[PDB]
Amino acid sequence: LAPVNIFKAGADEERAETARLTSFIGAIAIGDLVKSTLGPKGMDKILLSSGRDAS
Amino acid sequence: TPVILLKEGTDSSQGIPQLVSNISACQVIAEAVRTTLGPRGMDKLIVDGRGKATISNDGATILKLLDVVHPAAKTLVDIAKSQDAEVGDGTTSVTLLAAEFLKQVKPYVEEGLHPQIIIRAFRTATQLAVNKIKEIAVTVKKADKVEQRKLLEKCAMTALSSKLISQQKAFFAKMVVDAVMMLDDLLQLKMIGIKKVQGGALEDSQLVAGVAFKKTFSYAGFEMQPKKYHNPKIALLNVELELKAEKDNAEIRVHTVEDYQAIVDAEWNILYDKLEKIHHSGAKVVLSKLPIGDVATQYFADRDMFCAGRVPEEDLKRTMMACGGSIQTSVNALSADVLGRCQVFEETQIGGERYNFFTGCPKAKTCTFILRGGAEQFMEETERSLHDAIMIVRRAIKNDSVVAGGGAIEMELSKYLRDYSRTIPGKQQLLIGAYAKALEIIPRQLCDNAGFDATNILNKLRARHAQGGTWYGVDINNEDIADNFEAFVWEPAMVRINALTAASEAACLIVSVDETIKNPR
Amino acid sequence: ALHVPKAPGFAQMLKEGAKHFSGLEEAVYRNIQACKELAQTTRTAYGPNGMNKMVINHLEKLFVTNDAATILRELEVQHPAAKMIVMASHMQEQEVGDGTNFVLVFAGALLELAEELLRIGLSVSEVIEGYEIACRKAHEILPNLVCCSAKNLRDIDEVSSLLRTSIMSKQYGNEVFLAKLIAQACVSIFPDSGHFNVDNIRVCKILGSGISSSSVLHGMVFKKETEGDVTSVKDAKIAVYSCPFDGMITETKGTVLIKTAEELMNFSKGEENLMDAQVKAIADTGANVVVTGGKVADMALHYANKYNIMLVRLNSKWDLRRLCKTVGATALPRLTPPVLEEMGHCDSVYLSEVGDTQVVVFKHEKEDGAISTIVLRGSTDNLMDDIERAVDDGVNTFKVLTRDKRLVPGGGATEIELAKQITSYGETCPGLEQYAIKKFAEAFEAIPRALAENSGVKANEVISKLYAVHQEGNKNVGLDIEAEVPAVKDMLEAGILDTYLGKYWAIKLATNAAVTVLRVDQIIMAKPA
Amino acid sequence: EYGRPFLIIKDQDRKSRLMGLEALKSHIMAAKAVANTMRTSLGPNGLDKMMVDKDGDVTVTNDGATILSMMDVDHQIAKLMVELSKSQD
Numbered sequence A: 001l002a003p004v005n006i007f008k009a010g011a012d013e014e015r016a017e018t019a020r021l022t023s024f025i026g027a028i029a030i031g032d033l034v035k036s037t038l039g040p041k042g043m044d045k046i047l048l049s050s051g052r053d054a055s
Numbered sequence B: 001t002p003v004i005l006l007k008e009g010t011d012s013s014q015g016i017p018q019l020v021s022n023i024s025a026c027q028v029i030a031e032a033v034r035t036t037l038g039p040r041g042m043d044k045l046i047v048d049g050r051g052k053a054t055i056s057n058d059g060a061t062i063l064k065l066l067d068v069v070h071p072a073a074k075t076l077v078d079i080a081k082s083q084d085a086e087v088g089d090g091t092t093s094v095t096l097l098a099a100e101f102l103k104q105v106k107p108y109v110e111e112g113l114h115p116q117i118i119i120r121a122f123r124t125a126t127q128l129a130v131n132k133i134k135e136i137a138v139t140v141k142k143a144d145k146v147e148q149r150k151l152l153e154k155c156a157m158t159a160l161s162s163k164l165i166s167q168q169k170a171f172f173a174k175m176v177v178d179a180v181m182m183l184d185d186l187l188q189l190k191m192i193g194i195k196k197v198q199g200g201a202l203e204d205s206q207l208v209a210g211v212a213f214k215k216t217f218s219y220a221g222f223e224m225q226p227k228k229y230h231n232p233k234i235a236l237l238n239v240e241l242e243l244k245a246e247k248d249n250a251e252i253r254v255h256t257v258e259d260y261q262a263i264v265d266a267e268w269n270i271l272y273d274k275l276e277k278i279h280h281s282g283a284k285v286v287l288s289k290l291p292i293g294d295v296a297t298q299y300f301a302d303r304d305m306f307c308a309g310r311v312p313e314e315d316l317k318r319t320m321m322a323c324g325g326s327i328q329t330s331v332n333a334l335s336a337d338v339l340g341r342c343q344v345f346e347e348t349q350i351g352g353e354r355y356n357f358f359t360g361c362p363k364a365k366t367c368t369f370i371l372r373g374g375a376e377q378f379m380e381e382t383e384r385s386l387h388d389a390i391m392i393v394r395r396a397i398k399n400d401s402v403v404a405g406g407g408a409i410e411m412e413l414s415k416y417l418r419d420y421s422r423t424i425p426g427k428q429q430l431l432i433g434a435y436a437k438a439l440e441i442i443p444r445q446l447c448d449n450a451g452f453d454a455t456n457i458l459n460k461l462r463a464r465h466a467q468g469g470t471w472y473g474v475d476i477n478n479e480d481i482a483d484n485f486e487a488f489v490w491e492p493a494m495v496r497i498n499a500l501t502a503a504s505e506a507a508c509l510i511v512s513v514d515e516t517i518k519n520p521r
Numbered sequence C: 001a002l003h004v005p006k007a008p009g010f011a012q013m014l015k016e017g018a019k020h021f022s023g024l025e026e027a028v029y030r031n032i033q034a035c036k037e038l039a040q041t042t043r044t045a046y047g048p049n050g051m052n053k054m055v056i057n058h059l060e061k062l063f064v065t066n067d068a069a070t071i072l073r074e075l076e077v078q079h080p081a082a083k084m085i086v087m088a089s090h091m092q093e094q095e096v097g098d099g100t101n102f103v104l105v106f107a108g109a110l111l112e113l114a115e116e117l118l119r120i121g122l123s124v125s126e127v128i129e130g131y132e133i134a135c136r137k138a139h140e141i142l143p144n145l146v147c148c149s150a151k152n153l154r155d156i157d158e159v160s161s162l163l164r165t166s167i168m169s170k171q172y173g174n175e176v177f178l179a180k181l182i183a184q185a186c187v188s189i190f191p192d193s194g195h196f197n198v199d200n201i202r203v204c205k206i207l208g209s210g211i212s213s214s215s216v217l218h219g220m221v222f223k224k225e226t227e228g229d230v231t232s233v234k235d236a237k238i239a240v241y242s243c244p245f246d247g248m249i250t251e252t253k254g255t256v257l258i259k260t261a262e263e264l265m266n267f268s269k270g271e272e273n274l275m276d277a278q279v280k281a282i283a284d285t286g287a288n289v290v291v292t293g294g295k296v297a298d299m300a301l302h303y304a305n306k307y308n309i310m311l312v313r314l315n316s317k318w319d320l321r322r323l324c325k326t327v328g329a330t331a332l333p334r335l336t337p338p339v340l341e342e343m344g345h346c347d348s349v350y351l352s353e354v355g356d357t358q359v360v361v362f363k364h365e366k367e368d369g370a371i372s373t374i375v376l377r378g379s380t381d382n383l384m385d386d387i388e389r390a391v392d393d394g395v396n397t398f399k400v401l402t403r404d405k406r407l408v409p410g411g412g413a414t415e416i417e418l419a420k421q422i423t424s425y426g427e428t429c430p431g432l433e434q435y436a437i438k439k440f441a442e443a444f445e446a447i448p449r450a451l452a453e454n455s456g457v458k459a460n461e462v463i464s465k466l467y468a469v470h471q472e473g474n475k476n477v478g479l480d481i482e483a484e485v486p487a488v489k490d491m492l493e494a495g496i497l498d499t500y501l502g503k504y505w506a507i508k509l510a511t512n513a514a515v516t517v518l519r520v521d522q523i524i525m526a527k528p529a
Numbered sequence D: 001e002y003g004r005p006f007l008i009i010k011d012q013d014r015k016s017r018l019m020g021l022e023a024l025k026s027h028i029m030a031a032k033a034v035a036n037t038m039r040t041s042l043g044p045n046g047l048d049k050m051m052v053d054k055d056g057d058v059t060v061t062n063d064g065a066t067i068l069s070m071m072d073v074d075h076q077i078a079k080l081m082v083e084l085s086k087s088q089d
């Protein structure tokens, strides 16, 4: 990391080894979440809300 | 004791400790602007509370942006605006000369010398210094027309040597000189418009012998009307051409629908009457400070004529002065004289924006600059250097007397005072001698910045001046001394004369202070 | 430990936060010390060599002053005893205009000397009687000291010598140049018939060159700019209006009502035609410039440009009245064609620029005119204001000279003579009032001591030499400033004088301040808030 | 007595300052970081960046001007590179 700061407080940067790591973690996370609802014998999920008045 | 004279929190100091502390305080102010002097000077970057940054080389501008609260230092700030408001050039020269006057008499104050003796010393040499400048100033009162156009260029280039645009000083000097020679005999500064458009190289700047301004907000239908004319007639207006209510204090009461329909058609007949009155005058370009409705624009489109609304006031006055018409608040007396004539009108794209150009007027009294930079602070700094060239030419028109710069003038004055102090006896010998020593700060600060041996050059300069070489200054490129009058380093006589009086008055005022009282809040 | 339990009576009933002083020790000895402290503050600001002083008020404004009355106004005092002296000095400025520091030095010295008399056994009643007798005896002596007279107060050369001393104590080094300027301005606003009014001298400050480039303009100047396209006039006939330059309307609410198509269309045309005739009627009388104290309209401005009428606007209710005097015109409350009597005249009106500022100039070629203006050019705001105060002091001296023409020698020669003659009278008064009389004469010396101290020489050598010379019969011998070794000089031949009325009021108000303080016996103070 | 704390500038303690070569070297380090961030995105085989907005919006882009526009920077020299990119655009 260069000793000089270029970003305001709260801003963050990620690069090659860390950037491709984060992007792949997110994608497979959403893919594995919904695989259970696929095909003629998939099951259903429950969605309950903390914000929208416990819908 | 139980009842104290002045309220609690009052600060009071006096004596020699107070006066010496004021001398040292002014040294900090002269430090902020010290290394911004010379053909090889730098800039400074200042950031205010909100985060906006300003990059500047102008000496008066730097001192304004500092938040000085020291009462004695504020004197040096004010004389900067004094040189700024009278001649416009020499704001740093009057600051270094102010600090050097005080520093060279500081040991005498420690010895207990009465300040009123010090004050009499400064005022004695200044009348001698000023009267020396006027004697040896060079001028040619015979009116040669091409020499005048050369003298003004030399003065203009020398005012641009220490600025960001030094590499193009020969190109800009020609532009500035041409601007002033056709600006009437009162030379209003508002008669020159400076515009700033991003994108492009510095050499793409141009001067238009006319009026050019930005495209304004236009309604639906602005795009089916022609954008070029060869001999149009311009009708300047101050009347709002849109369908509206006559008076804010009006009121209509009616009984029958027959009059109702007649009233509805009355508003349209009013609007169509004004627009038919303009179209019959033969004008092709109409400009108004007030809004122009969409109905007018669509109507102006059907007859191949150009409309523009919400034009700024200043841009309209320049257009009147360049074209030669007059502003009309009514559309009942459009004679042939109240119209403006130009040789060509067009609308072009400049760096992403659209600009209106009125060029070709042979009787113009106004110019306009289009400045091309790469960033906001790049053209703002460009215009600040242009303003120094404009004011210098304005003064040179009224009085065409020049002296050689580059430290040549500061060594002729110092030698003269040194040859006059030896004639008078007493403590008046040491004070004038110390005064003459303060005048060789300018040649030292030029060599210190460039990076030479400042001690050797001064010794060479002092010997040449006392040998009998009046106009010998410093040679920046060659690291030596040379005659700056044959090297074309000129400046008007007003710049130096106004530098001494303001500097002498600031030094005298500060020394004459006994005690300072600050009361709470 | 134990405590002292707040002895009964008035002490136990007094509200918290309040104070109560009683007796000589806690009331008079404290007040004298408080007054003595105030004198030492402005004592160094006395005389031609009096050093400047720098004051920052509670609003971060910066003042560099030599004037004593100015310093006290911006200094803020809290002791009641010092306030009494302050009100005395402010009264002297209003009544005369100069000598605001003579009061502080004299009133301060009187109280200091009255301390020892109370210390050795005298009472406050006997001290006051001794002071008052000397005050009456001082005034009887004073007319005998007149040594010169103002001959003709409309002679430029003579007057400049009269005001030079009044400026010598303010701007040592530039007294000659400033004396010449004020002489020209005052001598040419002079009326034949008497009543020199002082407000008729205007000062305009413009930043720029040194002070030697300031000049005097026989007329008025404003920091404004023209509205129309006309800029300069060569021989102007002026019309002055206190009303807006626009079509008038009813003060009661008034709306325009229309019922037919024709009235809707003909309203706008009718209004414009009416405005054209009104302006043309004005131009029919020959007016070249119109000045108004209010808002202007666009239609009026357009027609004013068409008929070559110069238009200016300024709203002060005090600048316009001054302008009425300058050109001789009279105000008008309604937009009507002016009567030939009601129109002023001026030899030139133009728009000019001076030091990065736009100004409008009403210049007379007449030497007298009605009022005059002095333009100040300096390098700093603080420099102008101090010069502005000097111009006021010089003018106020000219005001006094009109009231009375008698001058007395200055430089300490007047106070030395008074001290010599009061003591001679004080020697022939038996009783316990002889001591206070001699003390009063001894306080007059401080003014020659104060000048000598700041001059950087020993005070006792000068005072000893002044007494020895004055015994030989020289009434015009005073302190010499130019000499670095203490010496004396003749004042009448050196042209150093001051107004007789300046001394007459200064002595009267100074003693009145001292005896007023001595009459106090106890102080009751309410708490601050 | 000679150098007792005397105030010259409002809030004198809270302001910093850099003079001399250490001023120029600090600018160079700031300028280099901006160039090394966007060295990758040059040429047909270049790669892109995924911007993230103040509120959460996602934008994937390869244009030089936009990356420097959506970027939030503090160093004054960095803003000078942003204005340089826009002027060319």
Ligand SMILES: Nc1ncnc2c1ncn2[C@@H]1O[C@H](COP(=O)(O)OP(=O)(O)O)[C@@H](O)[C@H]1O
Pocket: B037, B038, B039, B058, B059, B089, B090, B091, B092, B093, B094, B158, B159, B161, B162, B405, B406, B407, B442, B473, B474, B476, B489
């Ligand atoms: N060609 C040159 N050779 C030597 N000195 C020069 C030359 N051009 C300008 N200077 C120097 O630049 C100095 C002032 O530059 P400038 O920025 O105008 O000062 P200020 O900020 O006081 O107006 C002058 O003292 C002059 O000696």
Ligand SMILES: Nc1ncnc2c1ncn2[C@@H]1O[C@H](COP(=O)(O)OP(=O)(O)O)[C@@H](O)[C@H]1O
Pocket: C045, C046, C047, C048, C050, C068, C098, C099, C100, C101, C102, C103, C165, C168, C169, C170, C410, C411, C412, C451, C479, C481, C496
């Ligand atoms: N040329 C002079 N030489 C000596 N004393 C002078 C001279 N001119 C003026 N003075 C002294 O200056 C005093 C008044 O100056 P000033 O400071 O204005 O006092 P004040 O505020 O009481 O008017 C006078 O008492 C006079 O004696």
Ligand SMILES: [Mg+2]
Pocket: B089, B090, B158, B159, B160, B162, B388
């Ligand atoms: Mg310059």
Ligand SMILES: [Mg+2]
Pocket: C098, C099, C166, C169, C393
């Ligand atoms: Mg006086």
